[PDB]
Amino acid sequence: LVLDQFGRNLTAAAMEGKLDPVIGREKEIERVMQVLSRRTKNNPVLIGEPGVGKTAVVEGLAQAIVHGEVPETLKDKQLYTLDLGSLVAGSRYRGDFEERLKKVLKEINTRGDIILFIDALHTLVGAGAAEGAIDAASILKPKLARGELQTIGATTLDEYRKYIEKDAALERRFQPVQVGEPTVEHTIEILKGLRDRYEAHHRVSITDAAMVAAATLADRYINDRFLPDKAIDLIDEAGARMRIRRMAEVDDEQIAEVLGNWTGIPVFKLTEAETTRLLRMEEELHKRIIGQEDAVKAVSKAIRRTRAGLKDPKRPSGSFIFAGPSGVGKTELSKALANFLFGDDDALIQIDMGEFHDRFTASRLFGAPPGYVGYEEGGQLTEKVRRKPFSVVLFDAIEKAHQEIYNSLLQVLEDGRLTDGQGRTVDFKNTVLIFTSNLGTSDISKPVGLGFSKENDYERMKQKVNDELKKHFRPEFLNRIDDIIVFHQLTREEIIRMVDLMISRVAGQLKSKDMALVLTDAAKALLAKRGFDPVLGARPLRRTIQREIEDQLSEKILFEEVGPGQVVTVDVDNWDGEGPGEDAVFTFTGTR
Amino acid sequence: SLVLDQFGRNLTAAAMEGKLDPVIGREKEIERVMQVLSRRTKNNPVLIGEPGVGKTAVVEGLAQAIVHGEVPETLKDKQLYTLDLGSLVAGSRYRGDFEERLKKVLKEINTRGDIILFIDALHTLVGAGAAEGAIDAASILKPKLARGELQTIGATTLDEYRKYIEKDAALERRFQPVQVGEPTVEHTIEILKGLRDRYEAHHRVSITDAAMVAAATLA
């Protein structure tokens, strides 16, 4: 008929079993039937976030009609999803659109058993409006008056106000039905009702453990989608990943593998290679950071809380103040933690807070408000975590930011949320937030008080850092931090191992020349004793290795005294550990 | 087809003719889009990633995986057409011309039932053919895409995903974000080794293994 060439008969689709079972949502299927029987405002527009089942309510209304579970005034009605696309299509002539829509409305009045459903009712504005032609909105607006057109609509909450609301005429006629996002317990009952559809398409079996896990892990580890689908996304893709393996049981663990592939958040059950890797994680971080054992443990307590499914899910996975002297591995541990969790230290979201000392550079973190330039791409904090929710976020030099930025990041440590420029909350609950401070190094001289006093450079330096911390930060900002770690000065024995870590970068660049770099134990002892400052640590060692090894090697390579295919052995002439260690000089001899 | 040849490029016909570059690696991403395409509803992967990480290549690696039989029986012998939205807009000057072209495309997909669609630059589906009173291509596809009766691969950059697809929150739901990550340097050397014969044959040169280790490291 006229309605089949435009609309899709949902009632006929419910007779043939082509609509998904809409379990739950019953209190709002029957509420749509209440609104259709009202005096005015008798057009139910289903408003709700995209994915909560607005189309499913009317698909559940079609299944209620074919089961005889409707009132006799809505008995044997034929729901038609009038798509505007088939109504515009064709129409290569004049009035073609108004008469194809008049023939729809004449067929609704003639049979009289049609409940029209206009999915995406906001798209009614500007349909078939051709040059010298009136859109589908202007044609129906009238019919609504006569009440000769009970329609059901379905918009989002944004696009309801953005259009349908505004129209004042529509207001006294359209009635917004809240289609709420279901709870987890409601979603499990949706997934139980949808077992036989997804167990038959994928020819798998979906356990009760998987569907409880699908609705729980989707509410927890997504902030961009909505319960019904977000959890059907996990069920359907796990049954799809399972049917690639049989070419038949979807479990709790198979859902978390799909959530791990999709959000990027490791929620899946730890493999044996990765379980022992988190056991040896402090040992694996010590391959890249020397010493700082109290700090490597505290970021080890945080990652192992997360992978034991055991952190507070109202609060970020790790929250840290790294504080202490300059150069002892605060940024290096943050890079090593990101190199652990991701294999690459450029996966660290490194938000260098020293360039945020203006009051209003907080718009770089969360984005511009809408309508102000750069809103559409705004947020270098929020968008990098909207994409990678499991992240290590480094706020390096946090004390060099403005105070209004901390109040923005105060909601972060409290709720795990951050309202960005648009207004969407970005889930920070799976982030390791590291707020690197350099407080306790602006006076660092073995800090002493007055005289006659008789373990001052830590046990004491630590409380000076914590005193400079709480006088700079809000006390409610620091109570939310999980662990405030004041770092140690690097001891002389840690500088000796820091030589090996820094020669290995220089030796690795000589491997690109097919050269080796062997240092004697006296050579590493001389770099360590001239690279040791007890107040800075490891950057005086870096500068020493540049001045004494790299700048000398850069001449020897450019002289071609040493060249490719040649092991540069670094020994020291003069001095023997017992002297002051500054009359001695390195010598560079190539061997092979 | 014949309706869909003038609005699409068959990538599986291009993969049989050796006209697609080899896609080295990316097999966790081709496996991922074969999962999303094997889903019951919302069976639509959008390949999000930074520009030039190989989002278009994953589909071209998928189209090579179809014609070499390395797909499941769900994706077996699917003819993957890259829907040219620019061809689909072009010459639609009368009312409903764009919409009837897209309905004729979608009717040809339903009758054949072996067509994966690749809408490269999926963000250009919003407002595609949305003239005066002209229902865009997004509103036509959104009923088909939500119920799984249209298998469509999108590919969008991460910037164009937050600027155009996340601003139409109904449309981003219909697509599953398959994150196509940037390759590592070791993965990129593997890509260059497998692309070596295409650029040696084109430039009549020989590319040393040193040159591709350098090209991934220095870039």
Partner: peptide, 24 residues
């Protein structure tokens, strides 16, 4: 003591040209 008043630039653009649908 001083305050800098910044200046929130707004996004302002000319109206969009439209493309027409023909009815013969």
């Amino acid at each position: 003591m001083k305050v800098l008043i910044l200046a929130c630039l707004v996004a302002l653009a000319l109206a969009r040209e439209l493309e027409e649908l023909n009815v013969p």
